[PDB]
Amino acid sequence: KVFERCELARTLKRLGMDGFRGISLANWMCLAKWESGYNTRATNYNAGDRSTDYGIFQINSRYWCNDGKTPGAVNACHLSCSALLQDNIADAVACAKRVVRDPQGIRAWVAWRNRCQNRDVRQYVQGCGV
């Protein structure tokens, strides 16, 4: 499913992402935008280390979900990576909450650092009623 901007914003708020571990909703929006373009079925193989990024938040198989083919990987979210490819983003959101519970927080995603950190991210939520 490819979410429309404001539709996603409202969904994330209802799932309790606004201010989770200090991360504003606009930051989560900026992340989803640059990671997948709001596409829940996005997958990305990383030939360099044999891991794959899954779904709307592009969560990595080496640490967060189990896909069976990633060497020396763990499953901190206790999910099959398949769960991160559903139209319903409930499982992806619960896993994202798990990710930011680690010391790095939102910084765990390098794309957030490159395109969201220290920027005016208001634009991602303006006019959405959240």
Interface ranges with Na ion (CB under 5 A)? 61, 66, 73, 75
Question: Among 66, 84, 100, 116, which residue interacts with Cl ion (rule: CB under 5 A)?
Answer: 66
80 interacts with Cl ion by CB under 5 A: yes
Interacting partner of 80 out of Cl ion, Na ion, none (Cβ under 5 to 8 A depending on kind) = Cl ion
Which entry of 4, 7, 49, 53 is annotated as an active-site residue?
A: 53
Q: Which does 92 bind (CB under 5 to 8 A by kind): Na ion, Cl ion, none?
A: none
Looking at beta carbons only, is 11 or 80 nearer to Cl ion?
Answer: 80
35 is catalytic: yes
Q: Per-residue DSSP letters for the chain?
A: -B--HHHHHHHHHHTT-TTBTTB-HHHHHHHHHHHHSSBTT-EEEETTTTEEEETTTTEETTTTSB-S-STT---TT-SBGGGGGSSS-HHHHHHHHHHTTSTTGGGGSHHHHHHTTTS--GGGTTTS--
Options 7, 18, 35, 87, the catalytic residue:
35
**What minimum distance in Å lies between the beta carbon of 60 and Na ion?**
8
Task: Look up 7 and say whether it is catalytic.
Answer: no
Distance CA 10, CA 77 (A): 24
Cα 94 from Cα 56, distance rounded (Å) = 12
**Would you please indicate which residues are annotated as catalytic (active-site) residues?**
35, 53
Q: Which residues bind Cl ion (CB under 5 A)?
A: 66, 79-80, 83
